[model samples]
Target: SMEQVAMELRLTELTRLLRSVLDQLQDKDPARIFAQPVSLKEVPDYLDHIKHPMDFATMRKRLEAQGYKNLHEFEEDFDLIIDNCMKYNARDTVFYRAAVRLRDQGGVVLRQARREVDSIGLE
Candidate 1:
């Protein structure tokens, strides 16, 4: 149906945008010294070891309230968060790791959505 198609398209665009951000970050830090090392072959499991100061559920709700209706919105919001993190030199902290975790989770969701879309003959 139309709703499913729209959702798939949105997910596709979001996946592309998220990939671009990840690629840019990787290019900047090939050694993965700043954020957790998340690659095509492996996804980092920092959640088990790291205790983030920020509550993810609350942060996500705040971000969503900022009109995150599409990929661009999400990117801009995340960019600001990352920029502030960089400004404060918090790369080694859990704050930066949280951002990376969010990106990785987004990738995971995108992949699953793509697979579903493909299996449903929507793409």
Candidate 2:
């Protein structure tokens, strides 16, 4: 099902972002970073916590500062995701399916993304 596929794709992207942050924290010093209490899911909030007015450019900068080095690469990754979601979700049937999934899922995915930013001490 396309809805399943979409959810999987977004999850993949979330995992990718998680991995990138993990690599950064590791680069700070493998032993210490590894030993520190950290979770992949904490990354988006971490980034947001450190910055005000977070946006794509700010996000890119934060990742780069953390030695991510390939900001455009991730940007492209997101662009593709957006493109796919826009195209697939635009179809009437697909839209209904996706919408139903969103409803049934209780907006878990969407809420997670938003909370990542909002829960980062922002008002």
Candidate 3:
């Protein structure tokens, strides 16, 4: 039942991926990039404060302005979020996307878990 085990692992990975994606897009105490709109002016400010500041309030507001009602809303756009961030930082974006794919691929196995287990036990 290695396939079964693998499916369970994939589900776990997807859950993790979903969590990490949310973490990035959520307002982290000071601030996180995805949570806020990066304006031209904010670019230099962001670069300057990016290292030291965690302005979650500002980021929350910016994200809200972008039509994200809350963390759940931002989470719904994870794929898009990763894609855009990748344009600026391919390394980070690629890593993030890879993790997401792991979770998605894991889902394939998870979808069949109950059925497979039931059949095995019944037989």
Candidate 4:
């Protein structure tokens, strides 16, 4: 169906923007803590505390698989990344501080992308 085709085109733009958002997060994340999944071996209590873990690599894989039905799902993971960090690590920790900065920096572009995606006519 042509409607489905148009949907793909619109989603293609959103998908690209989503990738950009991920790129910004990874770049801002100098420690690269969020680059990969949390290591249960390193932080045994991580999963015990952070039930929902999110990371750049997982996000990338999700994007590759077209797992997100829309921009909102992508947004969910963005917050999850930061939320898990702040929840698991104390504010004084470098990981927590880095997550804070990354959240603030990555959030701006993400919101911008979200707005742009919504503005697009999915028709």
Candidate 5:
């Protein structure tokens, strides 16, 4: 139960971070940024369908080609997706979901690291 509680708390932090990133993007382009239309339940499939006009396909292909294994490898691409969403006025398209996904992944990595450190009796 304690582990589950910790996981939920971390997920809440991740959600907050995601919303903060989205909110920060709003002022950069007043005309482009707006509330995303889809429900959270619909986001996964919606994100899969929407593509970054120029970058994502190439980037994804390259990552796969290189046999990348971790989110850290895609960190820049993740940031680019967020930026591209703002630049191209696609905040409501798929990038929002992408951001959320990245945040979730980062949380997982953080939790794992925490567990390892605790198990090793590290400060």
Candidate 6:
């Protein structure tokens, strides 16, 4: 109660760091695959393999509504997105390659947040 906005700023910073990587990907990816959610008509069987679909818009929605409790929570959401992407899409294609990049960079940002939060002792 005393620090209502405190947790909010922390989350924004975490999201900020992660979104930077995503924004970079947005530049490299002209298709804007990460821009929105995957459609049923697009894949026909996307939901057949992946449940609880995670996308940029929905993640932002949850973030805006204060869904993530901390940096790791945010990372979890990202991981969930790629996990579904990697599994549902062809593992040997560009999709998996990007997901692999996401896996690497995503972990990098989370580690950055860990150091950041740990240094600040926001916990």
Clashing pairs in 3: 14-103, 30-54, 30-55, 30-56, 31-54, 31-55, 31-56
- TM-scores for all predictions: 0.34, 0.28, 0.27, 0.88, 0.32, 0.75
lDDT of each: 0.47, 0.39, 0.43, 0.81, 0.45, 0.69
In the range 12-112, model 4's lDDT, one tens digit per residue, is: 76677777777876898888888899888988877778788999999999987767778789889988999998988898999899889998898788777
Q: lDDT score, residue 9, model 6?
A: 72
Error of 4 at 100 (Å): 0.8
**C-alpha RMSD for every candidate:** 12.2, 19.9, 14.0, 1.8, 12.8, 2.9
Q: Is candidate 1 or candidate 5 better by TM-score?
A: 1
Better model by lDDT, 4 or 5? 4
Off by over 4 Å in 4: none
Higher TM-score: candidate 3 or 5? 5
Task: Give the per-residue Cα lDDT of candidate 3 at 88.
Answer: 46
- Show model 3 residue runs off by greater than 4 Å: 1-31, 44-76, 92-123
How much RMSD separates candidate 3 from the native structure? 14.0
Error of 3 at 87 (Å): 1.7
| Segments of candidate 2 deviating more than 4 angstroms | 30-123
Overall local distance difference test of candidate 1: 0.47
- TM-score ranking from best to worst? 4, 6, 1, 5, 2, 3
Clash pairs (backbone) in predicted model 6:
none
Candidate number achieving the greatest TM-score relative to the actual structure:
4
Candidate with more favorable, higher TM-score: 2 or 6: 6
Residue 66 accuracy (lDDT) in model 3:
41
Instruction: Residues 14-106, candidate 2: write the lDDT tens digits.
Output: 555545543442343322312322233755454333322222333444444442333344344333323433343345665335434433342
Superposed model 6: Cα runs more than 4 Å off:
1-31
lDDT of 5: 0.45
Ranking by lDDT: 4, 6, 1, 5, 3, 2
